[PDB]
Amino acid sequence: GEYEPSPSDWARKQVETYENSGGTEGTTLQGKPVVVLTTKGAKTGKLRKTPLMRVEHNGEYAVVASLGGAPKHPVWYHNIKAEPHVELRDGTEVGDYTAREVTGEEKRVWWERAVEVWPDYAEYQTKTTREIPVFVLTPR
Numbered sequence: 001g002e003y004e005p006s007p008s009d010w011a012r013k014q015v016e017t018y019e020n021s022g023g024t025e026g027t028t029l030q031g032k033p034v035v036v037l038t039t040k041g042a043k044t045g046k047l048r049k050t051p052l053m054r055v056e057h058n059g060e061y062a063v064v065a066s067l068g069g070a071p072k073h074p075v076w077y078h079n080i081k082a083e084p085h086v087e088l089r090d091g092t093e094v095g096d097y098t099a100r101e102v103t104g105e106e107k108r109v110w111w112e113r114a115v116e117v118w119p120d121y122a123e124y125q126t127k128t129t130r131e132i133p134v135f136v137l138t139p140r
């Protein structure tokens with residue numbers, strides 16, 4: 001698409017609409033649901049808000065840290081590593097979670113859930129040179 005913003009400017013615009021509307025607008029991407037993760041900034045201490053694909057199961061969520069399978073980690077990856085207490089907004093509702101990087105069978109199961117929501121995640125694997133981080137968020 002020739003007449004679209006950069007992916008970074010799109011993410012900024014989406015998170016702005018999402019937050020300013022109290023989760024009543026801007027909550028989808030290609031028809032698929034998006035959440036807003038709030039993390040504590042590792043360096044600055046500021047609260048940082050990031051739109052991510054919604055992957056949910058019985059009140060837990062998972063988030064995938066991957067810029068299209070590229071190896072450089074998103075900055076919010078570092079915020080979670082430093083501070084596991086995060087907030088997650090799903091539409092009009094928000095809550096507190098403990099985020100942890102998962103491994104093994106747990107990671108495989110959540111990855112399958114994520115690929116059902118956002119099939120492109122499977123394609124990203126073909127570009128990888130580092131593990132793809134997956135976090136599971138449990139209510140707290």
Ligand SMILES: C[C@H](OP(=O)(O)OC[C@@H](O)[C@@H](O)[C@@H](O)Cn1c2nc(=O)[nH]c(=O)c-2cc2ccc(O)cc21)C(=O)N[C@@H](CCC(=O)N[C@@H](CCC(=O)O)C(=O)O)C(=O)O
Nearest residue numbers: 011014041042043044048051052053064065066074075076
């Ligand atoms: C460009 C950078 O963003 P980032 O945290 O590297 O994240 C890159 C992307 O993951 C981010 O744009 C995502 O929202 C993109 N994104 C997804 N990204 C994903 O990785 N996974 C997804 O499933 C996903 C879905 C998605 C859906 C909609 C959408 O609009 C965007 C989506 C950024 O926002 N810069 C900030 C960083 C803010 C920050 O947290 N800084 C820390 C720095 C700490 C340190 O560097 O150690 C601080 O304040 O101290 C800034 O500096 O102003």
